[PDB]
Curated annotation (Swiss-Prot):
GO MF terms held by the record: electron transfer activity; heme binding; iron ion binding
Similarity comment: family membership: Belongs to the cytochrome c family. PetJ subfamily.
Name the UniProt record assigns to this protein: Cytochrome c6
GO biological process: one example: photosynthesis
Name of the gene encoding the protein in the UniProt record: petJ
Amino acid sequence: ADSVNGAKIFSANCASCHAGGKNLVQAQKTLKKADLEKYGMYSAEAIIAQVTNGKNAHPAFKGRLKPEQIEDVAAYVLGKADADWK
Ligand code: HEC
């Protein structure tokens, strides 16, 4: 997958709710590494799944994003989390 492209996908599709790796509307569930771990989301497969089909009422992106773009934003998210969202 492509982290750098994922940044772009993230800015257009995720950052409204997850700016800075945070969660503007549900502060308990951010994209920081510790919160991803807590919720069993610290993996590309988990993130892809969440974003694709959107369960837990999460926005679903299958309609508007290609698989490859979903893979890309997931790798982006994991990279950022590892870097503590800079
Ligand atoms: C609001 C309109 C959102 C947009 C757009 C996206 N996300 Fe989101 N995300 C949102 C909420 C309200 C929650 C918490 C409830 C839940 O379903 O988990 C989340 C959570 C996530 C998580 C899990 C974070 C954690 O458990 O700590 C991930 C990994 C996630 N969101 C990823 C993500 C991505 C990649 C997005 C764009 C493609 C995206 N979200 C958009 C709300 C909203």
